[PDB]
Amino acid sequence: DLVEEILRLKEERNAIILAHNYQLPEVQDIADFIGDSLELARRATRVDADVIVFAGVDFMAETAKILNPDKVVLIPSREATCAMANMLKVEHILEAKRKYPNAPVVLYVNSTAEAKAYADVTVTSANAVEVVKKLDSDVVIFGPDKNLAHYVAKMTGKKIIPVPSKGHCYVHQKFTLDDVERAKKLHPNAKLMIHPECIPEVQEKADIIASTGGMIKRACEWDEWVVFTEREMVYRLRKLYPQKKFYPAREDAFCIGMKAITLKNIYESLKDMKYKVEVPEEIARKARKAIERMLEMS
Ligand code: SF4
Ligand SMILES: [Cl-]
């Protein structure tokens, strides 16, 4: 019984389990806190636990370690990785900076810790517009997601240069205008909640544009929603609001990296104290500073 074993080991290890909204239902069901990556990392800084088991992808566990350097942070599989974050290389940032010497570098939190060390400021989907509006430059380097960059450009009026030029999340890139039309045909009383990682023409059809935390916040505004994000978010929303109706926008919006994590490797993570997440000191210090500037600018 993996659940019973996990619960006992969590107590033995003085551990907290943090799960991203895209984790499998059986993982969400054993987590202590569920949410998006930055919010989970922040909430753990106020928790008296010795060990964090991060049920999510590598950059999320890295952010938890950056903000909780004094805790052991475990990732259940090193194959839990983010294809979008991995598209942004330090080279891309430096090459972009050498080309636009006066442009600030704004890093979406969905990005490696190493990339964060070169950012002037980080952003979440929820604070990206307010942060970028406060930058003096009308030209901004933004990464790694070109679709979020386009949304920020629209809402700020600034020129936003995506780094890398084609950075994107393959899960969110799948959604199309045909998916929007089908959603309205199959669920005519639903409103559309759309992640800003979706393509701009799909963003324009949204009733609300928000990442997963904002979807949870704004779900109270209507009783039926079609959800344009990774499909496990539907499970999360149905558990939060059993009185509402939620429908996935697609049959295939599946993040392979998120689903590298299973109940069995959460058990093995606590049993064997693996896999330990470490962040080099200089990267961690610089990544912290960009995050702190984000919170001051928002
Ligand atoms: S859903 Fe997209 S952005 Fe999130 S971890 Fe998976 S690949 Fe990365
Ligand atoms: Cl994600």
Swiss-Prot record:
<dbReference type="InterPro" id="IPR003473">
    <property type="entry name" value="NadA"/>
</dbReference>
<dbReference type="InterPro" id="IPR036094">
    <property type="entry name" value="NadA_sf"/>
</dbReference>
<dbReference type="InterPro" id="IPR023066">
    <property type="entry name" value="Quinolinate_synth_type2"/>
</dbReference>
<comment type="pathway">
    <text>Cofactor biosynthesis; NAD(+) biosynthesis; quinolinate from iminoaspartate: step 1/1.</text>
</comment>
<comment type="similarity">
    <text>Belongs to the quinolinate synthase family. Type 2 subfamily.</text>
</comment>
<dbReference type="Pfam" id="PF02445">
    <property type="entry name" value="NadA"/>
</dbReference>
<dbReference type="GO" id="GO:0051539">
    <property type="term" value="F:4 iron, 4 sulfur cluster binding"/>
</dbReference>
<dbReference type="GO" id="GO:0005737">
    <property type="term" value="C:cytoplasm"/>
</dbReference>
<keyword id="KW-0479">Metal-binding</keyword>
<protein>
    <recommendedName>
        <fullName>Quinolinate synthase</fullName>
        <ecNumber>2.5.1.72</ecNumber>
    </recommendedName>
</protein>
<feature type="binding site">
    <location>
        <position position="82"/>
    </location>
    <ligand>
        <name>[4Fe-4S] cluster</name>
    </ligand>
</feature>
<feature type="binding site">
    <location>
        <begin position="195"/>
        <end position="197"/>
    </location>
    <ligand>
        <name>iminosuccinate</name>
    </ligand>
</feature>
<keyword id="KW-0004">4Fe-4S</keyword>
<feature type="binding site">
    <location>
        <position position="37"/>
    </location>
    <ligand>
        <name>iminosuccinate</name>
    </ligand>
</feature>
<feature type="binding site">
    <location>
        <position position="125"/>
    </location>
    <ligand>
        <name>iminosuccinate</name>
    </ligand>
</feature>
<comment type="function">
    <text>Catalyzes the condensation of iminoaspartate with dihydroxyacetone phosphate to form quinolinate.</text>
</comment>
<keyword id="KW-0411">Iron-sulfur</keyword>
<feature type="binding site">
    <location>
        <position position="169"/>
    </location>
    <ligand>
        <name>[4Fe-4S] cluster</name>
    </ligand>
</feature>
<keyword id="KW-0808">Transferase</keyword>
<dbReference type="GO" id="GO:0034628">
    <property type="term" value="P:'de novo' NAD biosynthetic process from L-aspartate"/>
</dbReference>
<feature type="binding site">
    <location>
        <begin position="108"/>
        <end position="110"/>
    </location>
    <ligand>
        <name>iminosuccinate</name>
    </ligand>
</feature>
<feature type="binding site">
    <location>
        <position position="255"/>
    </location>
    <ligand>
        <name>[4Fe-4S] cluster</name>
    </ligand>
</feature>
<comment type="subunit">
    <text>Monomer. Homodimer.</text>
</comment>
<keyword id="KW-0408">Iron</keyword>
<dbReference type="GO" id="GO:0008987">
    <property type="term" value="F:quinolinate synthetase A activity"/>
</dbReference>
<feature type="binding site">
    <location>
        <position position="212"/>
    </location>
    <ligand>
        <name>iminosuccinate</name>
    </ligand>
</feature>
<dbReference type="GO" id="GO:0046872">
    <property type="term" value="F:metal ion binding"/>
</dbReference>
<feature type="binding site">
    <location>
        <position position="20"/>
    </location>
    <ligand>
        <name>iminosuccinate</name>
    </ligand>
</feature>
<keyword id="KW-0662">Pyridine nucleotide biosynthesis</keyword>
<keyword id="KW-0963">Cytoplasm</keyword>
